[PDB]
Amino acid sequence: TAPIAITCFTRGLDIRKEKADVLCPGGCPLEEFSVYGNIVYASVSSICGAAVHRGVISNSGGPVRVYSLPGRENYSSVDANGIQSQMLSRWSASFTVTLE
């Protein structure tokens, strides 16, 4: 059983399993990161965006680890590592990211 090597442009929309181990090949630069909620990264957030925001990895790529989070509401907006996370109106698909 193996992780999913994602193209570092894959958002939380593609990977919403209970817990999924993911590899982010390449450097994944500050190209497109619009993040939505801190900790509770709503689905639309990039896996890089969420991971580097969460502080899992530096802006370098690498192995990351996604955990499902149920639907949530009453989000916040917070910046981390030069990536902006913004509140949402009740996104019933979120996650929280970690390391392996």
mmCIF file of C-alpha atoms in Angstrom:
data_model
loop_
_atom_site.group_PDB
_atom_site.id
_atom_site.type_symbol
_atom_site.label_atom_id
_atom_site.label_comp_id
_atom_site.label_asym_id
_atom_site.label_seq_id
_atom_site.Cartn_x
_atom_site.Cartn_y
_atom_site.Cartn_z
ATOM 1 C CA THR A 1 0.000 0.000 0.000
ATOM 2 C CA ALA A 2 1.504 3.282 -1.228
ATOM 3 C CA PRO A 3 0.988 7.094 -1.142
ATOM 4 C CA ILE A 4 -0.348 9.142 -4.103
ATOM 5 C CA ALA A 5 2.301 11.132 -5.969
ATOM 6 C CA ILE A 6 0.324 14.252 -6.938
ATOM 7 C CA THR A 7 1.480 16.816 -9.548
ATOM 8 C CA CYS A 8 1.778 19.507 -6.782
ATOM 9 C CA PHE A 9 -1.225 21.317 -8.403
ATOM 10 C CA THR A 10 -3.742 18.787 -7.009
ATOM 11 C CA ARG A 11 -6.165 20.441 -4.538
ATOM 12 C CA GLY A 12 -7.979 18.906 -1.583
ATOM 13 C CA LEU A 13 -10.863 18.288 -4.085
ATOM 14 C CA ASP A 14 -9.021 15.297 -5.604
ATOM 15 C CA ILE A 15 -7.921 13.691 -2.263
ATOM 16 C CA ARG A 16 -10.653 13.479 0.444
ATOM 17 C CA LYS A 17 -10.144 9.928 1.723
ATOM 18 C CA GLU A 18 -10.255 9.233 5.459
ATOM 19 C CA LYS A 19 -6.431 9.506 5.548
ATOM 20 C CA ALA A 20 -4.231 9.609 2.416
ATOM 21 C CA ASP A 21 -0.436 9.788 2.271
ATOM 22 C CA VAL A 22 0.754 12.009 -0.627
ATOM 23 C CA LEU A 23 4.088 12.877 -2.324
ATOM 24 C CA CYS A 24 4.521 16.344 -3.810
ATOM 25 C CA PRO A 25 7.297 15.948 -6.470
ATOM 26 C CA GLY A 26 9.039 19.149 -7.546
ATOM 27 C CA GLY A 27 9.613 22.445 -5.702
ATOM 28 C CA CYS A 28 5.955 23.638 -5.972
ATOM 29 C CA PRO A 29 6.738 27.423 -5.989
ATOM 30 C CA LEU A 30 4.497 30.409 -5.039
ATOM 31 C CA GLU A 31 2.638 29.909 -8.373
ATOM 32 C CA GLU A 32 -1.034 29.527 -7.326
ATOM 33 C CA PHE A 33 -1.840 29.285 -3.586
ATOM 34 C CA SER A 34 -5.236 30.545 -2.464
ATOM 35 C CA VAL A 35 -5.984 28.683 0.761
ATOM 36 C CA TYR A 36 -9.300 28.573 2.553
ATOM 37 C CA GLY A 37 -9.310 28.217 6.355
ATOM 38 C CA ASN A 38 -6.277 27.399 8.534
ATOM 39 C CA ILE A 39 -6.047 23.788 9.929
ATOM 40 C CA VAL A 40 -9.468 23.113 8.350
ATOM 41 C CA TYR A 41 -8.310 23.551 4.774
ATOM 42 C CA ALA A 42 -11.476 23.584 2.671
ATOM 43 C CA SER A 43 -11.439 21.304 -0.393
ATOM 44 C CA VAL A 44 -10.556 24.043 -2.950
ATOM 45 C CA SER A 45 -7.116 24.654 -1.288
ATOM 46 C CA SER A 46 -4.001 23.329 -3.117
ATOM 47 C CA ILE A 47 -2.286 20.381 -1.374
ATOM 48 C CA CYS A 48 0.919 22.513 -1.548
ATOM 49 C CA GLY A 49 -0.988 25.608 -0.384
ATOM 50 C CA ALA A 50 -2.486 23.789 2.624
ATOM 51 C CA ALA A 51 0.734 21.837 3.423
ATOM 52 C CA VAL A 52 3.140 24.805 3.331
ATOM 53 C CA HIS A 53 0.474 26.972 5.135
ATOM 54 C CA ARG A 54 0.124 24.255 7.844
ATOM 55 C CA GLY A 55 3.963 24.232 7.928
ATOM 56 C CA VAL A 56 4.168 20.477 7.023
ATOM 57 C CA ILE A 57 6.974 21.153 4.505
ATOM 58 C CA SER A 58 8.937 24.239 3.445
ATOM 59 C CA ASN A 59 8.143 25.645 -0.072
ATOM 60 C CA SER A 60 10.139 22.689 -1.508
ATOM 61 C CA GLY A 61 7.600 19.843 -2.025
ATOM 62 C CA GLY A 62 8.053 16.368 -0.457
ATOM 63 C CA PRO A 63 5.917 13.761 1.389
ATOM 64 C CA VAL A 64 2.766 15.216 3.044
ATOM 65 C CA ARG A 65 -0.192 13.450 4.759
ATOM 66 C CA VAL A 66 -3.856 14.436 4.346
ATOM 67 C CA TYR A 67 -6.596 13.587 6.905
ATOM 68 C CA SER A 68 -10.295 13.986 6.146
ATOM 69 C CA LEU A 69 -12.203 16.611 8.099
ATOM 70 C CA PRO A 70 -16.042 16.684 8.061
ATOM 71 C CA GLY A 71 -17.983 19.689 6.784
ATOM 72 C CA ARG A 72 -17.303 22.882 8.760
ATOM 73 C CA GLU A 73 -18.476 26.481 8.987
ATOM 74 C CA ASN A 74 -17.368 29.607 10.986
ATOM 75 C CA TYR A 75 -13.847 29.642 9.489
ATOM 76 C CA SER A 76 -11.130 32.319 9.960
ATOM 77 C CA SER A 77 -8.537 33.998 7.685
ATOM 78 C CA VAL A 78 -4.818 33.618 8.634
ATOM 79 C CA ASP A 79 -1.471 33.874 6.753
ATOM 80 C CA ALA A 80 1.316 31.336 7.230
ATOM 81 C CA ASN A 81 4.679 31.124 5.425
ATOM 82 C CA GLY A 82 3.515 33.783 2.870
ATOM 83 C CA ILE A 83 0.310 31.925 1.870
ATOM 84 C CA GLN A 84 -3.103 33.389 2.747
ATOM 85 C CA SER A 85 -5.947 31.245 4.100
ATOM 86 C CA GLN A 86 -9.443 32.844 3.947
ATOM 87 C CA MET A 87 -12.788 32.018 5.656
ATOM 88 C CA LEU A 88 -15.643 30.277 3.736
ATOM 89 C CA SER A 89 -19.420 30.032 3.947
ATOM 90 C CA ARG A 90 -20.003 26.421 5.191
ATOM 91 C CA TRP A 91 -17.716 24.262 2.985
ATOM 92 C CA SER A 92 -19.030 20.722 3.599
ATOM 93 C CA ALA A 93 -15.685 19.180 2.443
ATOM 94 C CA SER A 94 -12.464 20.054 4.342
ATOM 95 C CA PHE A 95 -9.206 18.390 5.498
ATOM 96 C CA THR A 96 -6.245 18.880 7.879
ATOM 97 C CA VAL A 97 -2.708 18.062 6.679
ATOM 98 C CA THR A 98 0.330 16.543 8.520
ATOM 99 C CA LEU A 99 3.686 14.743 7.848
ATOM 100 C CA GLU A 100 4.342 10.968 7.731
#
